[PDB]
Amino acid sequence: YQKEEPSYFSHSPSPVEVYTEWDPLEEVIVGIMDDIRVPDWDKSLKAIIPEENHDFFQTYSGKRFPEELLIKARQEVETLAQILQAEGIRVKRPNESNHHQPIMTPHFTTGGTFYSAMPRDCLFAIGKKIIEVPMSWRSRYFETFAFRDILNDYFTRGAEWIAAPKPMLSDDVWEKDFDFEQEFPFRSIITEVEPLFDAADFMKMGRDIIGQRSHATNKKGIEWLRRTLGPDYHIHIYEFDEPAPMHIDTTILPLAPGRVLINKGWVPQIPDIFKDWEILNPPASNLPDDHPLYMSSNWIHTNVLMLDEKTVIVEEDEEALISAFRQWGFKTILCPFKHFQTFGGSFHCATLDVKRSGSLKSYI
Buried b (16+ CB within 10 A) or exposed e, 202-222: bbbbbebbbbbbbbbbbebbb
Exposed, middle or buried, 25 (CB in 10 Å: 0-12/13-18/19+)?
Answer: buried
Q: Nearer Cβ to a second copy, position 64 or 107? A: 107
Q: Nearer Cβ to a second copy, position 152 or 323? A: 152
CA atoms within 13 A on the CB side of 121: 25
With contacts defined by CB under 8 A, name the span among 16-24, 224-232, 288-296, 316-324 that binds a second copy. Answer: 224-232
User: What residues act catalytically?
Assistant: 198, 247, 349
Distance CA 49, CA 289 (A): 16
Eight-state DSSP code of residue 221? H
**Binding-residue total with a second copy (CB under 8 A):** 59
* Near a second copy by CB under 8 A: residue from 41, 60, 145, 363: 145
Q: Nearer Cβ to a second copy, position 1 or 86? A: 1
Is 67 among the residues that bind a second copy (CB under 8 A)? no
* Near a second copy by CB under 8 A: residue from 11, 67, 68, 102: 102
Q: Nearer Cβ to a second copy, position 218 or 250? A: 218
With contacts defined by CB under 8 A, name the span among 28-36, 149-157, 199-207, 326-334 that binds a second copy. Answer: 149-157
Near a second copy in 256-315, by CB under 8 A: 269-275
Distance CA 116, CA 132 (A): 14
For 288, other C-beta atoms within 10 Å of its C-beta total 8
Q: Nearer Cβ to a second copy, position 87 or 241? A: 241
Exposed, middle or buried, 314 (CB in 10 Å: 0-12/13-18/19+)?
Answer: buried
CA distances from 193 to 146, 164, 172, 267 (A): 28, 14, 7, 29
**Site track for a second copy across 225-244, x = CB under 8 A:** -xxx-------xxxx-----
Is 252 among the residues that bind a second copy (CB under 8 A)? no
Positions touching a second copy (CB under 8 A) are: 1-5, 7-9, 97-98, 101-107, 109, 113, 132, 142, 144-145, 148, 151-152, 155-156, 160-166, 168, 193-195, 213, 219-220, 222-224, 226-228, 236-239, 269-275
